[PDB]
Design a protein around this motif. Structure first.
Motif, PDB file in Angstrom:
ATOM      1  N   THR A  98       0.843  -1.174   0.000  1.00 39.87           N
ATOM      2  CA  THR A  98       0.000   0.000   0.000  1.00 39.87           C
ATOM      3  C   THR A  98       0.881   1.227   0.000  1.00 39.87           C
ATOM      4  N   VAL A 120       0.092  11.630   0.393  1.00 39.97           N
ATOM      5  CA  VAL A 120      -0.577  12.528   1.315  1.00 39.97           C
ATOM      6  C   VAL A 120      -0.130  13.948   1.030  1.00 39.97           C
ATOM      7  N   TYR A 177      -4.214  20.493   8.076  1.00 40.54           N
ATOM      8  CA  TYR A 177      -4.779  19.171   7.887  1.00 40.54           C
ATOM      9  C   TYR A 177      -3.900  18.373   6.939  1.00 40.54           C
ATOM     10  N   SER A 178      -4.201  17.074   6.880  1.00 43.44           N
ATOM     11  CA  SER A 178      -3.576  16.145   5.952  1.00 43.44           C
ATOM     12  C   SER A 178      -4.673  15.471   5.143  1.00 43.44           C
TER      13      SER A 178
END
Lengths: 50, 50
Positions: free
Chosen positions: B39, B43, B49-50
């Motif tokens: 995976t 990001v 924020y992310s």
């Protein structure tokens, strides 16, 4: 040209289910949810919360 | 009159039987699956924020 389309399904938090949807009939325009052991926030249209 | 008699009677042969039907149940066996979930997540870390 599209170079990738990440499509995901986030849950609706409880405080958004009872306070917003069931009460006022509206839904927040931002999704703050934990995915792959990280809390991600997605803002609709890359704009402010509405 | 010369009226008829009892029938000859069926000659019955005693024995043992095994009754086979067509097999539709699949052949099942235990297998083992070795693999690797890779995976990779991209990001975008915003200001808050992310």
């Amino acid at each position: 040209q599209f170079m990738g389309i990440f499509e995901d399904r986030a849950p609706v938090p409880f405080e958004e289910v009872i306070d917003k949807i069931n009460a006022k009939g509206v839904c927040r325009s931002t999704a703050k949810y934990v995915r792959n052991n990280m809390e991600t926030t997605a803002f609709h249209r890359d704009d402010h919360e509405t | 009159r010369r009226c008829p008699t009892r029938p000859e009677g069926q000659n019955y042969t005693e024995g043992i039987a095994v009754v086979f039907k067509e097999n539709i149940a699949p052949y099942k066996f235990k297998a083992t699956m070795y693999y690797k979930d890779v995976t990779v997540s991209q990001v975008w870390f915003g200001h808050r924020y992310s």
